[PDB]
Amino acid sequence: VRKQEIIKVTEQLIEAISNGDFESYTKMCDPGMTAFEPEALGNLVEGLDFHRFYFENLWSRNSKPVHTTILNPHIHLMGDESACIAYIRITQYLDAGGIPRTAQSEETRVWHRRDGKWQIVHFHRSGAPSVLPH
Amino acid sequence: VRKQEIIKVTEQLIEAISNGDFESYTKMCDPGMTAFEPEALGNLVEGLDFHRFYFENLWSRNSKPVHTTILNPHIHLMGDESACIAYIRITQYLDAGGIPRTAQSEETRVWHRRDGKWQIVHFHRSGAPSVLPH
Amino acid sequence: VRKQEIIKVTEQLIEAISNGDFESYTKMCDPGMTAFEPEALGNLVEGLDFHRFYFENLWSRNSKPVHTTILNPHIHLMGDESACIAYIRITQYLDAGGIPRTAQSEETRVWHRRDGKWQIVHFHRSGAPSVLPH
Amino acid sequence: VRKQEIIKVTEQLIEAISNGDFESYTKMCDPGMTAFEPEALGNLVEGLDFHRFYFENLWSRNSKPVHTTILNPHIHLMGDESACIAYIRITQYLDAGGIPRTAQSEETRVWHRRDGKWQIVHFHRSGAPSVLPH
Amino acid sequence: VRKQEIIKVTEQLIEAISNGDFESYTKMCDPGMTAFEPEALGNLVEGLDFHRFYFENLWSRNSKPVHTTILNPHIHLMGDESACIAYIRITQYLDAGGIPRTAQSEETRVWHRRDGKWQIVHFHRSGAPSVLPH
Amino acid sequence: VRKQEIIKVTEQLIEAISNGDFESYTKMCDPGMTAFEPEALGNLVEGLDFHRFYFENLWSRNSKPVHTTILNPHIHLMGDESACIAYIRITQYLDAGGIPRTAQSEETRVWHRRDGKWQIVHFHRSGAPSVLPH
Amino acid sequence: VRKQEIIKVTEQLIEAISNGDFESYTKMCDPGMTAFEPEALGNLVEGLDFHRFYFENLWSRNSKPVHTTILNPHIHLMGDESACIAYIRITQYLDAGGIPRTAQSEETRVWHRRDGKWQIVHFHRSGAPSVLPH
Amino acid sequence: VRKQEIIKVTEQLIEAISNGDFESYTKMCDPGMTAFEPEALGNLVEGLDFHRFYFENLWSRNSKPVHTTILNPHIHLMGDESACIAYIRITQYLDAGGIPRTAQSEETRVWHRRDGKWQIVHFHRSGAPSVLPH
Amino acid sequence: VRKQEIIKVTEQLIEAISNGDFESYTKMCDPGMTAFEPEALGNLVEGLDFHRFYFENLWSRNSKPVHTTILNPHIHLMGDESACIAYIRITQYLDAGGIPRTAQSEETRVWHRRDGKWQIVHFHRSGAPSVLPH
Amino acid sequence: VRKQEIIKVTEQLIEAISNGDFESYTKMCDPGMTAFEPEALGNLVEGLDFHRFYFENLWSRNSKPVHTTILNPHIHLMGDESACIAYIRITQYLDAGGIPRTAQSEETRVWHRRDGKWQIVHFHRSGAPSVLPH
Amino acid sequence: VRKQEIIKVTEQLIEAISNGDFESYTKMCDPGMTAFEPEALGNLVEGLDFHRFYFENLWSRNSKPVHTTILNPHIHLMGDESACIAYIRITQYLDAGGIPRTAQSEETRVWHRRDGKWQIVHFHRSGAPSVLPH
Amino acid sequence: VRKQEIIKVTEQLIEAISNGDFESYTKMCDPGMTAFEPEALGNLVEGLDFHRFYFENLWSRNSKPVHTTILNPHIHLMGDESACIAYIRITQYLDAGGIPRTAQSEETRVWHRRDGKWQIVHFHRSGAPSVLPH
């Protein structure tokens, strides 16, 4: 019951990221959120300004078929207020010439229940970049 | 006050890992702990059996000079029970020929206050492997 | 007689895959089927959703000449209900510029006779990816 | 109950392979067993003569620490006589200089219950070679 | 108060460089300014003639989206007349095909308060070149 | 006269670094000194603890012939309290086999006259690492 | 006299292959013919179905200038019924941009005089592939 | 019966080559024998002087374990006087450090029954060189 | 006074080379002039015929922006008749796609005052070729 | 006098080759002429048929500017009937994009005075291929 | 008869070179002899001083087994005084570890009958260097 | 007569450099001498201090056989006081394992007759470094 809620909210976040829906993304993310990801080049970025660039330039333009598979999710519940979820992500997309391609990443997300709703406080990503290479 | 406690416990964990003190490491880690790290080759490993190999074969034998610098730690407190810490780690070591070398990693750790003491539930590492290459 | 049936059903499966006939493919595959293949990047995928992407985007569009040769098939019969077949597959195709190309794979397939008809339960592929590279 | 038996026999086979115990290996393997593996260079080898070389020259000499982790096993039962098991394998070993190393493979095994005991009829391996590289 | 002034003037300089506004750039730079940068190929260039080429040919033509993030600025005040600022710079841009890309540089700038206004006397840059590669 | 003083103090600092004289180095460096250098891997390090490792392990052991040439020094004087010096540095050394080798770096140093004596507040280095590679 | 006949029939076969004349090729080849060639990827292919693909897609379309030189032919006559011929083959062709290119192969052919006419039973080719690369 | 004789004589030749028994090799080979092999660098060598070097320097000194597997032999009988045999060859050996290694070759051999005994007239080899690389 | 004359004549020569003005170039060069340059591939070329090709085909056609910086010129005067000048040359240009690029060369020129005017007798160039690569 | 004649005839041959004048080339070449050149791939070709391909396809079509420089010719006269000439050849040409390029070769030519006129009997070329690469 | 003499003298020269017999080599070579060879780096060397280094340092010390095969010699006779010979040379040797190795070269030699004995005037070599690489 | 003097003094300088005779080298070099060479990494070095390192560490220790060939020297005389010489230099040496090696450089030297003796004022070197690589 409690783990299904975390899985559901993570699925909502992933679907919002896929569609370039920056409004929903801003709604589910904490203002002070922190991130490790391949695009930051080893640095820790804070806030949502760093990620708005990719929504504006990549997600809000591209609409080609993309399929996402979430493998072996694991959830840690820390009281009734906070949770952590870690999983593997396989993304199938199409390159410039229209040839199917696949990429893999490992992702961790930390959720806090602020004022009655779940919000990401930190997230760490490894493996393939979010920007899909041809 | 509360962030200093997390910094202190993280420093204790790092120092215990450096010295190959598997007893302290087992004391600070949750039995169900999960890990993402370069050595797992993209897989999520559970338990402490995976890490005991490196204590037995690397940390419990090597004693050459190693210096660790922790850069830009950031801490999220989620109530009074749980916390998350993210930082950059620079490690200076000596290779096989005795030439100084440096490596960088990005690390996240999730702490839960179980039965009055902090314990790692999940951790995610990126960048250089823990096993120092020559 | 019994080995010829397995060879025939494997040929039907291969021909259905070649033509992008997802209906027949779904008919010959078990709902709980598992797969190892180069496209999964070392992971074990379950179900038919992972493979539907390539039918939608590769097999249901491309129609260029493709020739398939099956080398040294070997069949193990396990009672009257189950069988296993292992073979080498050589595929001749045309790249982007229209130059003939060849690729090789090694393939194993496990068939179970459910409710009177054969169905794949597991399959493992090595070598060249199914997505033909230029 | 029935899946635990397959897991147990697979663990016995893996432990026997680790120790270079060619007698047990010959006991659990069918005389007509077939194999796909990286060492065969894309060919299908039959019988146990191909594998005896590595028992004689690698397993029966080397005794350095090796740790094996089996990830996400999946089992298909085909009646009461036959079964198939597919899993990921992580192997931690020591190279020539004594530096810890890790390797990953994907493995499928087909078991038949002949005359009251389980025996491998076919097996397919992908990823790292069994011969551990430095 | 005094560090905020240096941060503000550095932001003005960066924004002027971004827009290809050579007039403002010439206004903020000392005539005898010196520079280390990747484009000089290990040499120390003096004056503003070396940099006018890139304003004429790159900044005064290109207008595609560019986002700049300044990480961990550190400021040294040397009396009331001079200051030094060192920081990391992350630049997000679009390559030839329109794919988002990121680059990192480390930058130091020395400011002198001449005749009541701040002016750059020397600057040293490392990492990615200013000319954004595809 | 005033530029000769800066050149002299820079020569003293370089000679002290060459001889592994950590006492003199600590004497000439400000406690809050900051540094960009290739060994930090793109990060800004503060304090003298990061550099003590190389004095302990490289400069305090090695004593092979090393020759240093300083090319085209340029000096900016900012009042009577602060100065900046930028130059090219050629280092001739011997590798592991005893073969002469040469390396080049570009270096900037910022000096502040605190309590009547010059002290480094910041320094930025590019090109070859200080640790001489074979 | 008898060696000239083998040379003549080999020349006829080569000319028929050059022109994409699959009818003549089928006439000169035994139904059970076997082949080693670079395109088979280390496998032994039997029959003429493997080679029909290249006649259909490469020889029956391309008509650009091609020049063939046969170097140092050697012939072994085994009775009055069978012969073997081994030679070097240099092929001059034009790539995609129209630039002359050259390739070399080593070729062996085994001829049997069945029902009064010579027919290839086996052939082995090394070196450059028949499919001419740009 | 007649194909078994060719298989037997080929096995004798391979075993004689393995043991460095140049006398038997000279006995089974025709004086005018011709050869294509990787060691000749694309040239056709005649006689047995080219191969005597490897018997003198490699086969007559090395005695480490070597295992040979012959895959998918195919035989063409041309009357009662001549035959041709084509097969794949897998060789397992030990490199300089004692690590097991495997190599693959494709081989064709032409036998003529002179004065009542079989003799090689021509042979063509592809793939791995006979000289085993570490 | 005398060094300024050499600097002036060298600037005239460089400007004439930049504009593809072969007449002025021929006027400033001795008929027996010799040259070392990267385009000669390690050979010493004599006369002006070798350089006329690049005037005809490169300088007399291209007119895109090019900026030249001369660094650290050094002049040796040998009596009143002859001089030598050595300097570093940085060239900023635009590649095929219009991206700014930079190149560096080291250049020596020997001037003789024949019949009252200066003329190049020999010149030696190292580093980047004169033909600007994209 | 006698060396000038050889130089003249060599210049005529080179100019005829440059213009794609196969008639003159055939006139100056002996029917039994032999050649070593990079295009033959290490083989010795006899006759003029091998070279006619490049006249037909390269020299008889291309007419872009090409400049040839002959460096350090050396001539050996063997009686009044035969001579040998060896020289270096620098060729300046234009690639596909119109960028000047240079290539170097070393060439030897053997001339025999048959029936009162000089004819090439053998020639050996090293270095760059005659077919000019972009 | 006349071609056999040239073959004999060439064999004598090759055998003398193999044994490091600089006296015989000097006896068979003309004082003004010229050479193209890979060791000269594209230059034409004159005299015997260049080759004496390799006799002193390589041929006069090494005595390991070396086997030479001469393939497809071709001879042009120019009157009764001069001749030219061109051939392929295969050399089998042993590297540093004692592993057999093979190399190929193409060679031309020009002989003049001075004062009643044959002498080399020019020679041109391509392919592998004479100095055998491991 | 006058060119022979320059050749003689250049030979003396080269022989002095070969023997590590720093006294003679200092005697023939001007105090203000300038140099371009590969070891300076694109910089112009002044004085003899830069070159003393290689005399101390390379020439004054190594004594293995080295042979030098000077190809195609060209000399320009500028009055009776100054001269310039340009040539190619081939150096034959022995690497670490004792294998002969060859290197090529292009060199220019400017001589001035000061107080009755010739002295180098400038020299420019291209190609192989003076420090001989294995």
Residue numbers in the entry:
A (entry chain C), B (entry chain J), C (entry chain D), D (entry chain I), E (entry chain B), F (entry chain K), ...: 345 to 478
What does the study report here?
We expressed and purified a recombinant form of CaMKII comprising the α AD fused to a fluorescent Venus tag, separated by a flexible 15-amino-acid linker. From a single sample, we obtained two cryo-EM structures for the CaMKIIα hub, a dodecamer (12-mer) and a tetradecamer (14-mer), with 6 and 7 ADs in each of the two stacked rings, respectively. The Venus tags were observed as a blurry density around the hub in 2D averages for both 12-mer and 14-mer. The 12-mer and 14-mer hubs were resolved to 2.7 and 2.6 Å, respectively. The 14-mer hub has a 12 Å increase in diameter and a larger central pore compared to the 12-mer hub in negative-stain single particle 2D-class averages of holoenzyme hubs. The superimposed structures of the 12-mers between α-isoform and β-isoform had a root mean square deviation (RMSD) of 0.35 Å, while that for the comparison of the 14-mers between the two isoforms is 0.3 Å.
The calcium calmodulin protein kinase II (CaMKII) is a multi-subunit ring assembly with a central hub formed by the association domains. The AD hub, which evolved from bacterial dimeric enzymes, extends the β sheet to form lateral contact interfaces (LCs) needed for ring assembly, while the ancient dimer contact was preserved as the vertical contact interface (VC) in the mirror-symmetric two-stack hub. Linkers with variable length and sequence between isoforms and developmental splice variants, connect each AD with a peripheral kinase domain (KD). Here, we present near-atomic resolution cryogenic electron microscopy (cryo-EM) structures revealing that hubs from the α and β isoforms, either standalone or within an β holoenzyme, coexist as 12 and 14 subunit assemblies.
